[PDB]
Every structure is written in structure tokens, then in C-alpha cells.
PDB file of C-alpha atoms in Angstrom:
ATOM      1  CA  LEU A   1      -3.284  -0.880 -13.608  1.00  0.00           C
ATOM      2  CA  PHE A   2      -0.900  -3.538 -12.145  1.00  0.00           C
ATOM      3  CA  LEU A   3      -3.537  -4.739 -11.824  1.00  0.00           C
ATOM      4  CA  UNK A   4      -5.795  -1.676 -12.117  1.00  0.00           C
TER       5      UNK A   4
END
């Protein structure tokens, strides 16, 4: 999520 950071990213993914």
C-alpha cells in the first residue's frame, strides 16, 4: 500500500 506504500505503494501496494
